[PDB]
Amino acid sequence: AQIGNCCTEQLCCVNDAVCCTIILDDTGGTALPIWDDATTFVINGTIMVENNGTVG
Amino acid sequence: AQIGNCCTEQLCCVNDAVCCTIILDDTGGTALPIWDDATTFVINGTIMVENNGTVG
DSSP states (O other): OOOSOOOOOOOOOOOOEEOOOOOOOOOTTOOOOOOOOOSSSOOOOOOOOOOOSOOO | OEESOOOOOOOOOOOOOOOOOOOOOOOTTOOOOOOOOOSSSOOOOOOOOOOOSOOO
16 A cells, blocks of 8 residues: 655746846956846846847 | 846947038149048938039
């Protein structure tokens, strides 16, 4: 006779989106921090960059 | 869940008009400066010249 149930540990799935606009100038090769991870999770997703400045 | 709003960067539209009158004589092919641009904007508009001097 089975005692207890192995069952599962159902996990909630988080799908968030972030958007911002910046005034970008010459930074001399230095990377401006936009997003950083401080958790132990595995994170996937898509990153989109659109440059609306004057052409040329 | 959306975080923030891309929104927009609404731009004010400037539509100015300028008028002046000059006493024009022979300049020997040299162009008399009337208007110059010192900004980085893209400027459109209409230019009108009326010569009211004596006919002929």
